[PDB]
Design a protein around this ligand. Structure first.
Ligand SMILES: Nc1ncnc2c1ncn2[C@@H]1O[C@H](COP(=O)(O)OP(=O)(O)O)[C@@H](O)[C@H]1O
Ligand SMILES: [Mg+2]
Lengths: 667, 50, 196, 49
């Protein structure tokens, strides 16, 4: 409907302008401009009245002003000395058909052509690369020197060739050889320096990315680590960082060379023929549209590839971390099958990426060939008409093909850099994520009494906020007295321990240390004054001494030995190969369970904490050590919270608190 | 396509070989180390190869 | 050693009269099942954790029967998604005692001939402790398997048919509860240590 | 030899990261994020050299 109406109205307007209306209009460029304006006004009015301008308006202004404007440009480049132009309506049907085709093709190209996230991520990458500015300055300097030398080499190469082909003068041959070698030597030196600088800049950027991402991850809240997987985080930290800096040495060099050369080449081809120079801009629309489509697809597939790589890395992480459990069920083949399935998904994503890239390269090669054929045909027509000579035509063809190649390379490389930077979106997201934690405190009092107070504390884990765990808990822990928190599994005792250490914030009520919120105390002071021996202690690979003093900047060996003696860990420590310098293994694997618990107790006690939270600290402990570590923990100036599953070796506690289903029960 | 097949096959073979070792091989080689060798060394090798 | 993770340097360890290395990997590891001291739980649904390593995926009837035997049905059923509840990588969702119940169900779903319980009752509550006691000394299936019960809860040790006091890597003594109590050796000293 | 050393240093960094990110409650309960960062930075310094 709308298209037929547009055609009919356009035909009627052109017929009217062909008749007595045209005679009133002037002749020449003003006549064509006025005819186009009248055509546009008539179409706009007759479409606004009929309400068909919703989607056909875009095509109006070009279709009506493509013929006049074109003519103007010609009269501005080839001159107006030629005959006055003919009116659109009076022109034959071929001009109208070509105008329709031009308007439609421009409309389609603009639809394809119409990013901020990529730009902001690239700006962030530039901010991260700022510290490497001197290296980039040196690289740019060497690049400029290399280009300048490579502009001089060809003259002497040609001199050598000419001397060989024609009369051979030994002196000229030697001089040409010497100068060719000299300039090649200088250019090669500069190119090597440039490449080395770019490579080192890339490596520094990669290491900086890794450090910043890891330091940002360390600051996140614990719900972040509950909602994510360690293998996938490691996959990000080891692969997306590589992607973010994987192209500088080559892409930067190519971009900068092309930028240096394009301006001069365009100047030259303007000097030869501005008409053909304007004609040569035919390629840019198609180039940019194709790049946009391909870049969208490429970025999508790159993100999917990184996700799949993370999943496969998690498969490997789980299989290797729990090796003794997979091997005790004869399930290695199952893990290998899972990994092979993940690798198959990754392979299919890789194949999609490569196939699309190959198709894009084929498409742009075809575009290049077609546009070069078109330019050659137009230049041949001009040369036949006598506008330009053979040498001018050849020089312009060389220059215009060179600029076409340079512009295509610029567009492709810029899009490739944007795709590579934007495919690593999770890295930037993690680096810029704000932990769901309260603002850091500043209280570091010299003297701490240790009086803890839970006041109507209600807590629900942020991962599952719909299920409360604590319901109006309220109690007091005094120094010099022992409080035994007892209840069944799932009661919420470890949740109380976590809240008392400020690992999580209560959804209601308050946790007070010395009458002030515990979140208002400094991180280091708080966690050096309030220490816990966890349910299943986690050790880190390294010496026993590091594990005991894990988090202390400077702890003397006498303190470590005293802590070991207090926890009864000195008995089995001296039986090790190197005493306190013996490697414990990953997760303390080369140890018995009771030895791990004793080492954790020694680590907790080395700090002389004001508040000590023993969360099942004597579960994997033999009866003798359980009796030994019964009640000496308190010293009259230390608050102690002994969490026990049952009323086992806790009846010697001053206060008893029974917890069931998150509710405190009075004695 | 051929290089993708090569990459996948090599990664699978390396993972299987790692899992075929003995119980103490995983106390000398730590989890992150083995994971980096399996997931990252093979990928770089395959990219360079292609 | 009894799971074939390590080979003995001396002596010999025979299952049904033949060394463990002579048995197929998966056959051996579905005929000998162990609950570890700190059981490992993978990041999958509880249904996939309980049946982890079985060539033929068991039906939900078998999985729920195993969970009932180990006492994990009570808390698994109460979960919003039930057996489809995805577990965290470290198993932090499952509290201590629940993870051991899931590991025990995983061990029991295989119907093994040798059942190792390595401090598996440390975290189990009263209900799961009663369930494991019933499984050991009351279940009709006890006649089809031998149990190695490494533990420190004397309630289960007292009923044990045999007791071995492995101190310093050597068995200082053995026999039934009455015999060791009469001997007044290391076992009696350990039992009466809290009473001192 | 150079590339072997590079791969080994990357593997050590991966070990540090994996060990730290798997025991975050323990790292935070002792206020030792800075120490883990320092270990990672030492490995990265090897890679840089
Ligand atoms: N990190 C977590 N994310 C979500 N839910 C959790 C998390 N940790 C524990 N829970 C849930 O909260 C309950 C509180 O029990 P918990 O304090 O962990 O054990 P217990 O009462 O035996 O000391 C758990 O049984 C579990 O259902
Ligand atoms: Mg607990």
């Amino acid at each position: 409907r709308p298209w037929t109406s547009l055609l009919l109205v356009d035909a009627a307007l052109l017929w009217l302008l062909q008749g007595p209306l045209g005679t009133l209009l002037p002749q020449g460029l003003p006549g064509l401009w006025l005819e186009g304006t009248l055509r546009l006004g008539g179409l706009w009015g007759l479409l606004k009245l009929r309400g068909l301008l919703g989607f056909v308006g875009t095509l109006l202004l070009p279709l009506c002003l493509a013929t006049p404007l074109t003519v103007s440009l010609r009269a501005l480049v080839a001159g107006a000395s030629r005959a006055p132009p003919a009116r659109v309506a009076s022109a034959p049907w071929s001009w109208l058909l070509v105008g329709y085709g031009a308007a439609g093709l421009s409309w389609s190209l603009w639809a394809v052509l119409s990013q901020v996230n990529n730009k902001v991520l690239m700006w962030r990458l530039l901010k991260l690369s700022r510290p490497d500015l001197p290296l980039l300055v040196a690289a740019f300097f060497f690049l400029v020197l290399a280009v300048l030398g490579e502009t001089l080499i060809p003259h002497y190469s040609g001199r050598v060739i000419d001397i060989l082909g024609g009369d051979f003068d030994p002196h000229a041959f030697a001089s040409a050889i010497f100068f060719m070698c000299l300039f090649s030597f200088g250019s090669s030196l500069s190119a090597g320096c440039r490449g080395g600088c770019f490579t080192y800049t890339m490596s520094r950027i990669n290491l900086r990315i890794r450090e910043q991402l890891f330091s940002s991850l360390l600051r996140q809240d614990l719900g972040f680590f509950q909602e994510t997987k360690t293998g996938e985080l490691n996959s990000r930290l080891s692969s997306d960082t590589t992607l973010m800096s994987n192209w500088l040495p080559l892409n930067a060099n190519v971009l900068l060379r092309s930028l240096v050369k394009v301006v001069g080449l365009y100047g030259f081809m303007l000097s030869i023929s501005p008409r053909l120079t304007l004609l040569s801009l035919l390629h840019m629309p198609f180039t940019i549209a194709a790049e946009k489509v391909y870049n969208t697809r490429h970025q999508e597939v790159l993100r999917e590839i990184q996700d799949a790589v993370a999943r496969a890395g998690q498969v490997v992480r789980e299989a290797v971390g729990g090796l003794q459990t997979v091997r005790s069920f004869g399930a290695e083949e199952h893990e290998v099958c899972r990994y092979k399935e993940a690798l198959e998904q990754c392979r299919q994503l890789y194949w999609r990426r490569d196939l699309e890239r190959a198709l894009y390269l084929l498409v742009r090669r075809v575009l290049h060939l077609g546009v070069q054929m078109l330019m050659l045909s137009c230049g041949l027509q001009q040369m036949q008409d006598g506008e330009l000579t053979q040498g001018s035509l050849l020089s312009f063809m060389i220059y215009q093909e060179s600029v076409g190649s340079y512009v295509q390379t610029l567009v492709y490389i810029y899009g490739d850099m944007l795709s590579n930077v934007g495919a690593a979106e999770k890295v930037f997201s993690y680096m810029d994520r704000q932990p769901n934690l309260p603002s850091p405190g500043t209280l570091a009092p010299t003297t701490l009494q240790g009086v803890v107070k839970f006041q109507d504390v209600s807590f629900a884990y942020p991962n599952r906020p719909d299920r409360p765990v604590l319901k109006g808990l309220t109690f007091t822990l005094r120094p010099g007295e022992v409080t035994a928190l007892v209840g069944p599994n799932g009661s919420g005792k470890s949740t109380v321990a976590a809240l008392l250490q400020n690992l999580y914030q209560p959804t209601g009520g308050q946790v007070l240390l010395d009458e002030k919120p515990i979140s208002q105390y400094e991180h280091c002071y708080l966690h050096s004054q309030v220490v816990s021996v966890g349910q299943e202690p986690v050790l880190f690979s390294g010496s026993v001494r590091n594990n005991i003093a894990y988090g202390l900047q400077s702890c003397e060996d006498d303190k470590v030995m005293a802590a070991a003696q207090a926890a009864h860990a000195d008995d089995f420590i001296q039986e090790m190969e190197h005493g306190i310098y013996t490697d414990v293994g990953e997760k303390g694997s080369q140890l018995a369970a009771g030895q791990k618990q004793r080492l954790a107790i020694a680590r907790a006690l080395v700090r002389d904490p004001r508040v000590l939270i023993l969360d099942e600290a004597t579960s994997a402990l033999d009866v003798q050590c359980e009796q030994a570590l019964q009640d000496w923990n308190s010293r009259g100036d230390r608050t102690v919270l002994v969490i026990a599953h049952r009323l086992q070796t806790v009846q010697r506690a001053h206060q008893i608190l029974v917890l069931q289903e998150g509710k405190l029960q009075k004695l | 396509n051929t290089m993708g097949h090569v990459h996948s096959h090599l990664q699978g073979e390396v993972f299987g070989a790692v899992l075929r070792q003995e119980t103490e091989f995983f106390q000398q080689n730590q989890t992150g180390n083995i994971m980096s060798r399996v997931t990252e060394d093979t990928s770089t090798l395959s990219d360079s190869l292609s | 050693l009894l799971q074939n993770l390590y080979q003995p340097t001396g002596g010999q360890l025979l299952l049904d009269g033949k060394p463990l290395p002579q048995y197929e990997h998966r056959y051996l590891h579905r005929q000998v099942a162990a609950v570890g001291q700190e059981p490992q739980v993978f990041g999958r649904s509880l249904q996939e954790n309980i049946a982890y390593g079985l060539t033929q995926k068991p039906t939900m009837e078998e999985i729920t029967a195993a969970a009932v035997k180990s006492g994990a049905h009570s808390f698994i059923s109460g979960l919003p998604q039930g057996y489809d509840t995805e577990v965290d990588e470290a198993g932090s969702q499952l509290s201590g005692g629940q993870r051991q119940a899931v590991a025990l169900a995983r061990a029991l779903i295989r119907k093994p001939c040798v059942l190792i319980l390595d401090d598996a009752t440390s975290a189990l509550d009263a209900n799961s402790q009663l369930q494991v006691e019933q499984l050991l000394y009351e279940s009709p299936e006890r006649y089809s398997r031998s149990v190695l019960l490494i533990t420190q809860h004397l309630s289960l040790v007292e009923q044990a048919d045999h007791i071995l006091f492995l101190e310093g890597g050597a068995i200082r003594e053995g026999g039934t509860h009455q015999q060791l109590m009469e001997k007044k050796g290391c076992y009696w000293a350990m039992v009466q240590a809290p009473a001192d | 030899l150079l590339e072997v050393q590079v791969r080994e240093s990357l593997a050590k960094s991966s070990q540090v990261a994996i060990e730290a990110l798997s025991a975050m409650p323990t790292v935070r309960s002792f206020a030792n994020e800075e120490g883990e960062a320092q270990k990672f930075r030492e490995k990265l310094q090897e890679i840089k050299t």
